[PDB]
Design a protein around this nucleic acid. Structure first.
Ligand code: MG
Ligand code: MG
Ligand code: MG
Ligand code: MG
Ligand code: MG
Ligand code: MG
Ligand code: MG
Ligand code: MG
Ligand code: MG
Ligand code: MG
Ligand code: MG
Ligand code: MG
Ligand code: MG
Ligand code: MG
Ligand code: MG
Ligand code: MG
Ligand code: MG
Ligand code: MG
Ligand code: MG
Ligand code: MG
Ligand code: MG
Ligand code: MG
Ligand code: MG
Ligand code: MG
Ligand code: MG
Ligand code: MG
Ligand code: MG
Ligand code: MG
Ligand code: MG
Lengths: 140, 59, 166
RNA sequence: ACAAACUCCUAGCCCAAUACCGGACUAAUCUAUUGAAACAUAGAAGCAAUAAUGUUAAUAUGAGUAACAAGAAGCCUUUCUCC
RNA sequence: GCCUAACGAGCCUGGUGAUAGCUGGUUGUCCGAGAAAGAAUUUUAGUUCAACCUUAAAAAUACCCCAAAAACCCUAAAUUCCA
RNA sequence: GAUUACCCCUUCUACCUUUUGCAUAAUGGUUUAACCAGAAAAAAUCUAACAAAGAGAACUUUAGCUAGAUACCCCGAAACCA
């Protein structure tokens, strides 16, 4: 009972589906296609991992620029926003930086205020005064 | 805040000429900020693939 | 073998509704198994494209290549069928729409070398295809002006978005 | 401050790998019954090629590249020019 | 040297799927677990045993481990062995 | 990866074989199609029959017997003999 593979056409089609937009001979010849397609998928999955650090880099830059406009550097801005107990994404923060410049300058004013409060608190060398923005709320 | 679409587009991506006076400055510290402004890295709309970046005139 | 091109003359259309644009005559013609090579034939085919049939005949006539006499006869045949078998008023009204060469079937032979080595020598044949259309030759495209470029560039600066930003 | 496969967070089908060794499924044939257009339970096998300076057929590239040939004029076989 | 364009021993057909501890190849998907050299050997390009390991099974203790304990002249980091 | 946008940006040392280690400047392949390489049932495990017995003859039996199912490639010398 001799058997041959009749459906070889669709087997090839399934790997050429992905190969159509490649340059040169990879979009035709089944060898070249197979290899370039495996390459393509591997870089696909690595890109999934990268694109999270890329987007986060982008965000940090935009936050840095927005912060620079108001004369405050990136680390200062972020730390002080945190020490005020305001937890905001860098995604949400960069979006505020572009599409709501007013609110964002409000934030930068807040952070700057909180920081000067910090310098004054630590240089003052006494334990008593709580700057109005230095109090810490425990939730109920 | 309410602009037509084409003018909003134009206003956002406008190229802005900067002047920077040089006399008695370390050329490195000069090139630091000159480069930042050149590249568009002061604009919160910045992206690598956008053409955005501004002229810089050093005198 | 595949014969298709020849059959493109066998299409019969539905009659004309009143006052529409008159669809200009298309004539197809080919010549199969010419003794010329495909690659040389290509240059002749490339030369006469878009020309009015009279200019094409003029060019071909004085050209040196042995393909010239061939493509010439083919254009004359095409013209004769254009006026006779189809109906075309004003036989100089034709221009060349599409001109092209395909490879025909090839002959195989031995080519002796030296020290008793042989190469495999392929006798070359090719087909010549031409499509003629009745009407004055289409206008040749003018090189982009500065007023064009500046328009592209602005249209691009103005197509930007703030990316990843919403 | 910025920085990982580490660790949180929101959902899950819930944690790497060469030699060797376990499992679960399935492509394409044929044969039993079904199935009727692509079939589903079994039983069977010449049972699945991106790699053997693989075999045959056909196509490219090198490449229109290397290399090949017909002494002159006329009235068309008649003179010339040479070996 | 030569014995029909390969002669330290012709060519052909058999023996012949000669025999290669030596190269070179060996085709679907997805999951479990996963290895580094102690012996002998015409042995060191290889095999066959042990040890580790994989797949099933039966069980009871396994690593860690405080005193206590293991040499006689001098002798460090540390081992062995156990609740 | 993406982008309004093909590029332009940013991130990535062809593939097999072979090795302690190969982007290697180690081997292999122009490309397409068709062909082109894992076979055995002693012992074992798994599923059933009947059981002090079991097998459609000869055998084996201190839970055994009988049946099924699970297994071990392809191409290459120089040679030697008629
Ligand atoms: Mg058959
Ligand atoms: Mg993750
Ligand atoms: Mg050829
Ligand atoms: Mg991080
Ligand atoms: Mg694993
Ligand atoms: Mg097979
Ligand atoms: Mg194939
Ligand atoms: Mg070679
Ligand atoms: Mg091959
Ligand atoms: Mg060629
Ligand atoms: Mg050349
Ligand atoms: Mg030459
Ligand atoms: Mg001559
Ligand atoms: Mg001889
Ligand atoms: Mg062998
Ligand atoms: Mg011995
Ligand atoms: Mg050996
Ligand atoms: Mg113990
Ligand atoms: Mg490396
Ligand atoms: Mg190889
Ligand atoms: Mg080595
Ligand atoms: Mg090297
Ligand atoms: Mg080499
Ligand atoms: Mg080698
Ligand atoms: Mg090679
Ligand atoms: Mg047995
Ligand atoms: Mg039993
Ligand atoms: Mg002997
Ligand atoms: Mg011998």
């Amino acid at each position: 009972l001799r058997s041959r593979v009749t459906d070889r056409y669709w087997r090839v089609q399934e790997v050429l589906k992905h190969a159509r937009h490649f340059r040169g001979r990879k979009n035709r010849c089944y060898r070249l296609a197979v290899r370039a397609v495996t390459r393509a998928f591997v870089k696909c999955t690595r890109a999934r991992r990268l694109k999270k650090r890329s987007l986060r880099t982008l965000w940090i830059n935009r936050i840095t620029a927005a912060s620079q406009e108001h004369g405050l550097k990136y680390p200062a801005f972020i730390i002080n926003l945190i020490k005020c107990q305001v937890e905001l994404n860098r995604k949400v923060l960069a979006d505020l930086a572009i599409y709501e410049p007013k609110t964002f300058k409000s934030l930068a004013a807040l952070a700057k205020r909180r920081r000067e409060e910090g310098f004054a608190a630590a240089l003052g060398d006494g334990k008593e005064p709580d700057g109005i923005f230095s109090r810490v709320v425990q939730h109920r | 805040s309410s602009f037509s679409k084409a003018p909003q587009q134009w206003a956002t991506f406008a190229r802005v000429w900067y002047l920077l006076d040089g006399k008695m400055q370390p050329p490195g510290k000069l090139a630091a900020m000159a480069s930042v402004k050149l590249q568009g890295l002061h604009k919160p709309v910045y992206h690598q693939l956008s053409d955005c970046g501004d002229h810089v005139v050093i005198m | 073998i595949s014969r298709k091109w020849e059959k493109k003359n066998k299409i019969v259309y539905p009659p004309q509704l009143p006052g529409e644009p008159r669809r200009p005559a298309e004539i197809y013609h080919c010549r199969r198994q010419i003794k010329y090579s495909k690659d040389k034939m290509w240059y002749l085919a490339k030369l006469i494209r878009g020309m009015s049939i009279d200019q094409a005949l003029a060019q071909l006539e004085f050209s040196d290549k042995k393909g010239a006499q061939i493509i010439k006869e083919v254009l004359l045949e095409a013209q004769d069928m254009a006026v006779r078998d189809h109906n075309v008023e004003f036989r100089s009204n034709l221009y060349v729409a599409e001109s092209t060469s395909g490879r025909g079937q090839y002959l195989k032979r031995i080519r002796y070398h030296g020290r008793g080595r042989f190469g495999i020598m392929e006798k070359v044949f090719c087909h010549y295809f031409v499509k003629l259309v009745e009407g004055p030759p289409p206008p040749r495209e003018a090189p982009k002006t500065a007023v064009a470029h500046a328009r592209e560039y602005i249209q691009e600066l103005r197509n930007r978005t703030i990316t990843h930003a919403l």
